[PDB]
Structure 1
Amino acid sequence: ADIQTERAYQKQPTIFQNKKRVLLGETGKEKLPRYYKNIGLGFKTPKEAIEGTYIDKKCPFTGNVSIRGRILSGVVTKMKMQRTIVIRRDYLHYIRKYNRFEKRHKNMSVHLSPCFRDVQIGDIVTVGECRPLSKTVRFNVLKVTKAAGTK
């Protein structure tokens, strides 16, 4: 109902949901078994991913992606695209001649899974590298930590 919003049927490819059963087991509950995996590197699977019902092939926990490479951090700056946000990474570049530094920044478009909700602008996000998901997206959100002003 709410999940089915596209012209094509949204399904989890590795789950077979047409297994026939007796009439007694049909009355109990129509609860599809969820597919999820541990991504490794000490990151825990959010409870909303295990208990959720969303369909996302690019989700690091319930989708077909692999996390390998560099693990980076950023601050959420824009949330206006579908399932992907823009974060900003700030740093200092050293100039040898003057023995000083200058402030520089980069912008990253990263994929945000539906399992992460209540994400606001200005909170810290830990992302991991994966295969290119689109023209400009190469990283996926792995952890979200709130800002210092959380009450």
Structure 2
Amino acid sequence: ADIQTERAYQKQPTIFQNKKRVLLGETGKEKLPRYYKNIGLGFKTPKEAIEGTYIDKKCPFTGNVSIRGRILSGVVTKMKMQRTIVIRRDYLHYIRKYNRFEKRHKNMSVHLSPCFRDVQIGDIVTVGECRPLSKTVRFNVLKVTKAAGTKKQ
């Protein structure tokens, strides 16, 4: 519900909240300033990252990761394991002797920031390489594309 659900106070490290709030200000409404950055490579910052209130230190827009290296794509298959999803990347492997292909796949775990709210199984995501964020996570979700949906019953 609220964002302070941990044992330690959750805050963006580069925002000073206690900026001498005195009688000349309104009580309220006050809204504490939000740190966000523009990652390069022509990727738009989602508006939910602009005026959201989540704290995520591994978010590419409001956190302390920097995207560099490889930009890949895949299809969401699991959405357990909080703030992290499993995507599947299918590809064809060429075998020279029979001069045909075979179908292979690899899973990678990627960090899904809470600026992407309506993410479902079967969606196509764009991921960017960052520094190691955990034992197995090295990529971070940059853009979510819906697949054959947008209309429900």
For normalisation by structure 1, the TM-score amounts to: 0.97
Partner SS state of residue 88, structure 1: strand
Q: 1:29 to 1:149 in 2, by over 3 A?
A: closer
Deviation per residue, 1:31-72 (Å, 9 max, x gap): 101100000100000000001000000000000001000000
Distance in 1 between the 2:22 and 2:128 partners? 44
Distance in 2 between the 1:91 and 1:49 partners? 32
Distance in 1 between the 2:110 and 2:92 partners? 22
Moved over 4 A (4+): none
Distance in 1 between the 2:51 and 2:15 partners? 15
Distance in 2 between the 1:148 and 1:139 partners? 25
Relative to its length, the structure with more helix (as a share) is 1
CA RMSD of aligned residues (A): 1.2
Partner SS state of residue 55, structure 1: coil
Shift of residue 30, structure 1, vs aligned partner: 1.9
Partner SS state of residue 28, structure 1: coil
Identity of aligned residues (%): 99
Deviation per residue, 1:117-136 (Å, 9 max, x gap): 11000010000000000000
More moved, 20-29 vs 140-149? 20-29
Distance in 2 between the 1:128 and 1:148 partners? 24
The unaligned stretches of length 5 or more in structure 1 are none
Shift of residue 88, structure 1, vs aligned partner: 0.1
Partner SS state of residue 50, structure 1: helix
Partner SS state of residue 86, structure 2: strand
More moved, 115-124 vs 19-28? 19-28
More moved, 64-73 vs 18-27? 18-27
Distance in 2 between the 1:123 and 1:64 partners? 26
Shift of residue 148, structure 1, vs aligned partner: 1.8
For normalisation by structure 2, the TM-score amounts to: 0.95
Deviation per residue, 1:74-111 (Å, 9 max, x gap): 00000001100000000000000001000000001000
The unaligned stretches of length 5 or more in structure 2 are none
Distance in 1 between the 2:132 and 2:68 partners? 12
The residue aligned with 2:4 is: 4
